[PDB]
Paper text:
pmcRibosomes are essential macromolecular machines responsible for protein synthesis.
Cryo-EM data processing of the M. acetivorans ribosomes from methanol-grown cells revealed a minor subset of ribosome particles (∼10%) that form a 50S dimer. Further analysis revealed that the dimer is stabilized by large, previously uncharacterized macromolecules situated between the 50S subunits. This approach yielded an isotropic 3.5 Å resolution map, enabling confident model building. Using ModelAngelo, we identified MRDF as a heterotetramer composed of two copies of the purine biosynthesis enzyme PurH (bifunctional phosphoribosylaminoimidazolecarboxamide formyltransferase/5′-inosine monophosphate cyclohydrolase, MA4012) and two molecules of archaeal translation elongation factor 2 (aEF2, MA1257). The N-terminal domains of PurH (PurH-NTDs) mediate dimerization, and each PurH monomer associates with one aEF2 molecule, forming a heterotetramer. The structural inactivity of both PurH and aEF2 in the dimerized state—supported by empty active sites—suggests that MRDF formation may occur under nutrient-limited conditions, where both purine biosynthesis substrate and GTP levels are low.
Author numbering:
A (entry chain BN): 1 to 174
B (entry chain Bf): 1 to 92
C (entry chain BR): 2 to 97
D (entry chain BF): 1 to 165
E (entry chain BI): 4 to 99, 111 to 173
The structure:
RNA sequence: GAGUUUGGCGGCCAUAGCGGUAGGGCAACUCCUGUACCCAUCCCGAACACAGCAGAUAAGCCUGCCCGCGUUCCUUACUGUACUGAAGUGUGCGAGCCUUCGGGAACUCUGGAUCGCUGCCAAGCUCA
RNA sequence: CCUGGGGCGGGACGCCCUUGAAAAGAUAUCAAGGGCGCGCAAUGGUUGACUCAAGCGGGUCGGAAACUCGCUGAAGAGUGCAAGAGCAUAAGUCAGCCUGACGUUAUUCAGCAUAGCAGUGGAUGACGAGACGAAAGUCGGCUCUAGCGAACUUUUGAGCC
RNA sequence: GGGGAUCCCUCGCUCGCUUGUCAAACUCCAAACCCCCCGUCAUCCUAGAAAGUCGGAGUCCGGACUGCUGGGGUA
């Protein structure tokens, strides 16, 4: 709302409402790579990001769309998909060489049992070292996809296909 | 101002955070067997007594609140640099 | 009468321009400097910590070490060499 | 997708003085709304009401969904489905006041309680006002996606048949 | 109290009235004279000072009174427009013991004007140019600076 | 392998803002549908969260355009003006001001542009 | 003691901010504006969630004096108290849990432009213990700069000589 | 909100678009000097740079000219 020369406009990313710069400063003071976890309504996405004076640089990137090749047919935007994406991202970064980072959720609310924390647990179980406390993890039943007991009998195959995709991804990255 | 009677803080002796009770420190009576008392009694005679005929000075507008923190576990007390307040109370 | 505080005569020394007030760009806080590198001291008023004396604002110091987050700088002040401690938020590399 | 749906309906009782009258007002409002009400707090002490800073003064409740729809139908019944133009805000919102909580079935007049009035306001938004309410990527809606007074009145006519005089 | 006291400019400005106390109000009442609404006066002369000086509000009021009287007498009550451009912004103070704590008390207000700065502007028709010029010369006689009249508009209308 | 679309993280932090106009979504995003659940409301699944079959580009987002306010840059006039570094047996009754050499505005005006540029990665694609 | 002689008046006699001060630093006067000799277990730390002042429109003797809804609103509020500076997904408001308003210790500032007191800033140091938080971090009080005192003496704390 | 039962009508401030003026303690702008650092030339420097240590002091009544419209002051 530039009223005149005295008006102050925020940064572009803050104007777009995509970043908290106070959190960004606190995370950059780590001097560690950021495991940036962002979730949309239909899938989840994880990146490994390092700062540069010219911008951010990404070392590794796993999305939910990669699970279909490993044999996942469930919704990419739920807990099982988030956990699988986290495991895939962690294993891929371990393959590439990077093995450490700090969790970056941005503006996402910190709620126990969220898809963000399912992806975090997947990254942890992939061997990718990252500080955390287990109390924010989702229950193992709903990481396997016990929410399929609610309304969908079609989704009753989520635990078995969960295990199958997990074993296939472990075979691919081990 | 009010400070709580009991709160959890660091004990320098047991080297942990324990509960400690705060106690106001009362100034004690000066011993009559101290070296300064003996020197005063020795320099008392006829005439001016020097520094022993000095009248005590004035007072600052506010005095510090002399507090002492006793660990509830080892029962040892330590005293820290203290604030300066007109009115002091313990929260209970 | 006139005081002798650290913030003496800092009204414009510790001002921000109109369109840079607020949170500063965070990139300036995670920049690393090498031993012997020359860096300017341009104090950021919004970063109320790690700030050297405003007397050294506008001076070029030489990085001689690091004390955690902050950098130690050798800075000329008249004819003396001072060791100035500064977070990188107030620092800036010299360009050749 | 430009139907001016009902974002929310708010019922507010400005008693003006806390205590047993406030408790009775909040209980009757909870009965008439089917949802917990919240106590409004004064922000400036004033000897006229003799209230102080941050003292409970009134109550208000927000209703969303079929509960809001049914209560709005009821209140439009008490107003006989009537609502004139001047009630409407400049941006599609309306509010009107009533006096007799006894007009809502399921609650009885009490000589101790008296009769407390209240104002009900429904806010008319469009399907997609989440853009300004969500946390991430929260942009203000453009002026071309808001709701006009005639749009709101047409919606009211075609939804509840509330003629505007 | 002669105007030669607070005449030379030797000092910084003194105008921030929130950091001083008790400034006497200015004697000058109006700043626009004659016919204020009309703007279609063809001839438009002005009085410019040729030295950097401080003009007290009483001197401004005296010059305004004399110019306004002359213009009203010659051109009529609405035959002219007169604008006093400068406001007394500087605060004149006086040291009222001797020289200990000599920072003065506020005694008046003055306008700090620069060389070639317009003080008064008079707009009139073609036939009233000499009357306006004579009145503005009379006004300049009351000011603490040498002055000159310049024609701003209507030079070809006069000659 | 080059380029485009979209998404994520960013840099400079209005040249990017505020405002107006016309088009798009196959994928992606989004709006959007619910509240078994993890999580939540000083009340409200509004939000957050979870689980998501439709509809929709009307919004967010993207592309094109508009000089309208704001900003930034250029151009002409003001103008080498204001101011100023050095020096001066130049000058004023005085407050001061002048000459030379060297630097050099701001505002306004004439006429223009500016309705962001840009780094890394990923995924869909468009290849010889 | 200072002091446009001294005296009377006053304290420019200790500390902090703006101007004076001439765009690095320094810079005097009984120079101008002034303030401080405190308050606060919350008016403090951390986390979460929110956004303020003031206008415009809607809502009942709830009056243009309340409360509530919608729009505008980079801050025109608040942040304990002078002045200046800082701060908007906050350094503000509310709520959850807390006491880092922690013991010891090293440097350098700029701590007082200082050769030079007490003492302060650090805050990025270190050791040892913690609060909050997924973590990153933040916390050595209150957003930064005032709120204070040598030697000797006594009293108090822990263990020693 | 100032003036002489339908507040029957007169209207100063307040808020904007234009005129006219301002500021030590205002700044959307913004020099010339000046300051730190880098390179360069220039000068000094092994007939000893910068730095360090030690011996001996004097000095803390100053004044003037040219600028800073320096501050204060009628001067």
């Amino acid at each position: 709302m530039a009223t005149g020369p005295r008006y102050k406009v925020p940064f572009r990313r803050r104007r777009e409402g995509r970043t908290n710069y106070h959190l960004r400063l606190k995370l950059l003071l780590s001097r560690q790579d950021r495991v940036v976890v962002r979730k949309s309504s239909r899938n989840v996405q994880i990146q490994l990001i390092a700062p540069t004076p010219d911008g951010d640089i990404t070392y590794s990137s796993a999305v939910s769309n990669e699970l279909a090749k490993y044999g996942y047919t469930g919704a990419t935007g739920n807990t099982t998909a988030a956990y699988l994406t986290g495991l895939l991202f962690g294993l891929k970064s371990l393959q590439k060489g990077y093995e450490g980072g700090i969790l970056d959720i941005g503006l996402q609310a910190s709620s126990a049992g969220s898809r963000v924390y399912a992806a975090l647990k997947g990254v942890v179980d992939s061997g990718f070292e990252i500080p955390c406390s287990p109390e924010v993890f989702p229950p193992d039943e709903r990481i396997r996809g016990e929410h399929i007991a609610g309304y969908r009998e079609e989704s009753s195959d989520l635990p078995e296909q969960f295990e199958a995709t997990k074993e296939k991804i472990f075979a691919e990255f081990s | 101002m009010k400070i709580p009677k009991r709160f959890r803080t660091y004990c320098p002796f047991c080297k942990t955070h324990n509960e400690v009770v705060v106690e106001r420190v009362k100034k004690g009576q000066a011993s009559s067997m101290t070296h300064i008392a003996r020197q005063k009694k020795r320099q008392e005679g006829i005439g001016n007594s020097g520094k022993f005929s000095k009248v005590p000075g004035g007072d600052k507008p506010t005095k510090r609140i002399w507090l002492r923190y006793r660990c509830t576990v080892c029962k040892k007390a330590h005293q820290r640099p203290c604030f300066r307040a007109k009115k002091f109370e313990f929260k209970e | 009468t006139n005081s002798h505080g650290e913030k003496r005569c800092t009204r414009y020394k510790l001002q921000k321009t109109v369109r840079e007030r607020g949170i500063s760009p965070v990139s300036r806080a995670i920049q690393e400097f090498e031993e012997g590198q020359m860096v300017h001291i341009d104090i950021d008023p919004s970063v109320q910590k790690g700030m050297p004396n405003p007397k050294f604002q506008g001076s070029t110091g030489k990085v001689i070490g690091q004390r955690g987050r902050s950098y130690v700088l050798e800075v000329r002040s008249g004819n003396a060499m001072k060791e100035v401690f500064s977070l990188p938020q107030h620092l800036k590399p010299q360009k050749y | 997708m430009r139907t001016p749906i009902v974002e929310k309906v708010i019922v507010h009782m400005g008693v003006g003085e806390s205590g047993q009258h406030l408790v009775n007002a909040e209980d009757i409002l909870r009965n008439i709304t089917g949802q917990e009400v919240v106590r409004c707090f004064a922000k400036r002490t004033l000897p006229a009401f003799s209230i102080k800073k941050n003292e409970p003064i009134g109550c208000k409740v927000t209703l969303r969904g079929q509960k809001a729809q049914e209560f709005l139908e009821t209140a439009l019944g008490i107003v006989e489905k009537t609502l004139n133009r001047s009630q409407f805000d400049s941006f599609g919102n309306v509010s009107f006041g009533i006096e007799e909580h006894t007009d809502f079935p399921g609650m009885r007049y009490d000589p101790n309680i008296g009769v407390f009035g209240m104002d009900v306001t429904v806010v008319l938004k469009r399907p997609g006002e989440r853009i300004c309410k969500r946390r991430i990527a929260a942009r203000k809606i453009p002026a071309g996606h808001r709701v006009t007074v005639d749009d709101a009145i047409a919606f009211l006519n075609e939804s509840y048949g509330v003629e505007v005089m | 109290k002669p105007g030669s006291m607070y005449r030379n400019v030797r000092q910084r400005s003194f105008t921030r009235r929130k950091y001083m106390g008790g400034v006497p109000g200015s004697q000058v009442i109006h700043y626009d004279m004659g016919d204020k609404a009309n703007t279609s006066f063809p001839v438009k002369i002005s009085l410019i000072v040729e030295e950097k000086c401080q003009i007290r509000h009483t001197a401004l009021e005296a010059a305004r009174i004399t110019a306004n009287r002359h213009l009203v007498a010659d051109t009529g009550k609405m035959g002219f427009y007169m604008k006093l451009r400068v406001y007394p912004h500087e605060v004149i103070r006086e040291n009222k013991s001797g020289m200990r704590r000599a920072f003065g008390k506020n005694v008046g207000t003055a306008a700090r004007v620069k060389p070639m700065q317009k003080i008064f502007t008079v707009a009139v028709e073609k036939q009233n140019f000499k009357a306006a010029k004579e009145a503005l010369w009379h006004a300049g006689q009351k000011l603490p600076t040498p002055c000159r009249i310049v024609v701003d508009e209507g030079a070809e209308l006069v000659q």
